[PDB]
């Protein structure tokens, strides 16, 4: 705290409680006792624990009818109206597309949509496969996930 | 019909003005004006102006018949005090509270 380190009033003889600093934490303007530092909140996840969790959640995406596998899911030109009509055709409201090879037109046709997300088979994470209602995998994406996890 | 007059931020202590405001509560207003005329306090001068202003606000705004009016509700509240410094002996500083009042007179014929 910005301020001087001198004693405000001498140790014995005033009617006041004894103090030693204007920067004391029990004084106004000059507090925090256990002030925060910038810190890293990252936890360690074991490799086998991360993969066992992904296998468990993706098994529940299978068994709760939350997984769709198609041959190919793409778009001819990068416009979001085409993918809006396309996802309204397939009865998909809140959807996570996951594709084997990373696509550009599909990344631009769903960048504006918040209900829709588009990931690679490499870029899967545990909290998004639980967050979205349906998960539409490509068959190449199923092959790559089955390789990456086994 | 009630008719209110106030002196807000009157430069007198509330304790001093309550001693004069307790003279004229419940009285008729013609008698209360003479009570305040022949009372030798400064608060009588302060509260007589409020009473006369309540009479006039009754007469001009809605009112009736000055013979009818009574002083039914008179009260003094404490206002924002001023903080001053008073030097004393041996380098000690006292504070002076310069206490203000709010004087409220409600006049009503019924």
């Amino acid at each position: 705290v910005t301020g001087s380190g001198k004693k405000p009033w001498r140790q014995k003889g005033t009617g006041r409680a004894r103090s030693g600093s204007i920067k004391s934490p029990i004084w106004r303007s000059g507090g925090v006792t256990f002030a925060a530092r910038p810190q890293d909140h990252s936890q360690k996840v074991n490799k086998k624990m991360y993969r066992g969790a992904l296998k468990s959640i993706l098994s529940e995406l299978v068994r709760q009818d939350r997984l769709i596998v198609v041959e190919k899911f793409s778009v001819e030109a990068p416009k979001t109206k085409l993918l809006a009509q396309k996802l309204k055709d397939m009865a998909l409201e809140d959807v996570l597309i996951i594709t084997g090879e990373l696509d550009e037109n599909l990344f631009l046709a769903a960048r504006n949509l918040h209900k829709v997300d588009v990931r690679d088979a490499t870029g899967i994470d545990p909290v998004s496969l639980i967050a979205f209602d349906k998960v539409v995998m490509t068959a190449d994406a199923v092959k790559q996930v089955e390789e990456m996890l086994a | 019909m009630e008719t209110i007059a106030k002196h807000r931020h009157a430069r007198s202590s509330a304790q001093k003005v309550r001693l004069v405001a307790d003279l004229i509560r419940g009285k008729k207003v013609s008698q209360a004006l003479d009570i305040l005329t022949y009372t030798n306090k400064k608060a009588a001068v302060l509260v007589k102006k409020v009473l006369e202003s309540a009479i006039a606000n009754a007469e001009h705004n809605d009112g009736a018949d000055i013979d009818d009016l009574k002083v039914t509700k008179i009260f003094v509240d404490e206002g924002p005090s001023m903080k001053r410094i008073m030097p004393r002996a041996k380098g000690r500083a006292d504070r002076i509270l310069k206490r203000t009042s709010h004087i409220t007179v409600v006049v009503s014929d019924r």
């Binding site: 014995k12 003889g13 009617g15 | 041996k90 380098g91």
Partner: peptide, 22 residues
């Protein structure tokens, strides 16, 4: 402030004068 006032304390009252500035 600084006037002292006791025979010998750090700060008491006392009408004397060598002990006493609060």
């Amino acid at each position: 402030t600084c006037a002292r006032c006791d025979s010998x304390s750090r700060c008491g009252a006392x009408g004397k004068x060598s002990g006493x500035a609060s």
